[PDB]
Amino acid sequence: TGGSEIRDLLCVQSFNGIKVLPPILSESQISGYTTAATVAAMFPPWSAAAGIPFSLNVQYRINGLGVTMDVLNKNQKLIATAFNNALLSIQNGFSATNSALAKIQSVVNS
């Protein structure tokens, strides 16, 4: 309503009847839902992790592939360090020309 810019397309579209209404749930609520799911997966009672501590869940999931259990709990420190390193790498990889951002800007630009 109040501005000195004219090259924006959204104002012209909105004045010509084309408008993008907000969704019925705000993204803050969905972020709260994902946070609640993650915390319930991590902290007791382990609702989203089948009622078991998370590190033991990782241990059993790795052991089911074929890894013996003797080397698993003797490498627990480096397993946690590798998991944190993977999380930090997947956190920092969004700064580059990633493929998930390719999809997000693809749907936005489409």
Partner: protein, 74 residues
């Protein structure tokens, strides 16, 4: 669908070391304390059952933060 209608709060344990560095873990359930000896309980119905090898996954060695009790034999 199965559905509980009542609940009970108990103290549980995901595993414990019982012998010369061996580990036991419940198949589907938890270990509970009952008068200086541990018993298995199902994860959807509170019922103490004695320690067997049909509800326990064996380990070559136990985790560092498992409970220590040499008294339990299997």
């Amino acid at each position: 669908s199965y559905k509980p209608i009542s609940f009970k709060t108990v103290l549980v344990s995901p595993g414990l070391c019982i012998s010369g560095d061996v580990g036991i873990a419940p198949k589907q359930g938890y270990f509970i304390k009952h008068n200086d000896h541990w018993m298995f309980t199902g994860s959807s119905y509170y019922y103490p059952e004695p320690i067997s090898d049909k509800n326990v996954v064996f380990m070559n060695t136990c985790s560092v933060n498992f409970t220590k009790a040499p008294l339990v034999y299997l």
